[PDB]
Amino acid sequence: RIPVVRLKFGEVAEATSVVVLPVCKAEEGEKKILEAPMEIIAGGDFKVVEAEKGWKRWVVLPSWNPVAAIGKGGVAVSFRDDRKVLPWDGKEEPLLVVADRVRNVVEADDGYYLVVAENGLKLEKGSDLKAREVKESLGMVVLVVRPPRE
């Protein structure tokens, strides 16, 4: 289904590589995701970066391979509760969803695509969108990040 890698406590000891994504929220809505800077210019030495647009919120994510692969068009969406967004089971915790707007076109039947739901923002299977003939989406979910816990 959706690839889910959970951030864990104590992971701050030695990250060799890390990536940065702008942050959008369920309350902020689809408009914020359109507003977020897509191209982050890497003029980096050990990371120095500039963004095409100024953005208030930034999440620092480890260079997990799916997140690293995205590059441009990478965004993180904050959800207060996991259950509403996740088609499957949830444990009642805040959810971070990484989405690639570059692949927003629905071509992957099993692929999950962030879309604007009537209630708010939801992750929808591609096949389901194809059944409703929705050719485009906000972003294609690449990874779901779960919070550190005890």
Partner 1 sequence: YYTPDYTPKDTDLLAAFRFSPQPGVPADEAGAAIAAESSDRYKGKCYHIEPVQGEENSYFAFIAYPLDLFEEGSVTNILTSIVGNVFGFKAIRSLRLEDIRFPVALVKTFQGPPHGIQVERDLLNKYGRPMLGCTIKPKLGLSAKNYGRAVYECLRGGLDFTKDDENINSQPFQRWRDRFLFVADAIHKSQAETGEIKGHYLNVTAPTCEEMMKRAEFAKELGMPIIMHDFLTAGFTANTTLAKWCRDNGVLLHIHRAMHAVIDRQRNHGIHFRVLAKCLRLSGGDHLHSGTVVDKASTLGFVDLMREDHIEADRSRGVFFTQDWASMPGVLPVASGGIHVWHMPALVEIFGDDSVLQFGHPWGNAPGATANRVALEACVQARNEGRDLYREGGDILREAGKWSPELAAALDLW
Residue 91 near which of a copy of itself, partner 1, none (CB within 5-8 Å, type-dependent)? partner 1
Please report whether residue 11 would count as binding a copy of itself according to CB under 8 A.
yes
Residue closer to partner 1, measured from CB, 33 or 70: 70
Please report whether residue 121 would count as binding a copy of itself according to CB under 8 A.
no
CA distance 92 to 147: 11
CA distance 5 to 2: 10
Residue 46 near which of a copy of itself, partner 1, none (CB within 5-8 Å, type-dependent)? a copy of itself
* Contacting partner 1 within 113-142 (CB under 8 A): none
Are 113 and 126 contacting, i.e. CB atoms less than 8 angstroms apart? Answer: yes
Q: Of 4-12, 31-39, 112-120, 130-138, which segment contacts a copy of itself by CB under 8 A?
A: 4-12
CA distance 59 to 81: 18
Q: What angle do CA 37, 49, 10 make, to 5 degrees?
A: 95
DSSP state, 92? S
Please report whether residue 112 would count as binding partner 1 according to CB under 8 A.
no
- Which residue do the tokens 């707007």 mark? 101
Residue closer to a copy of itself, measured from CB, 66 or 135: 66
Q: Which residues bind partner 1 (CB under 8 A)?
A: 3-6, 13-14, 64, 66, 91
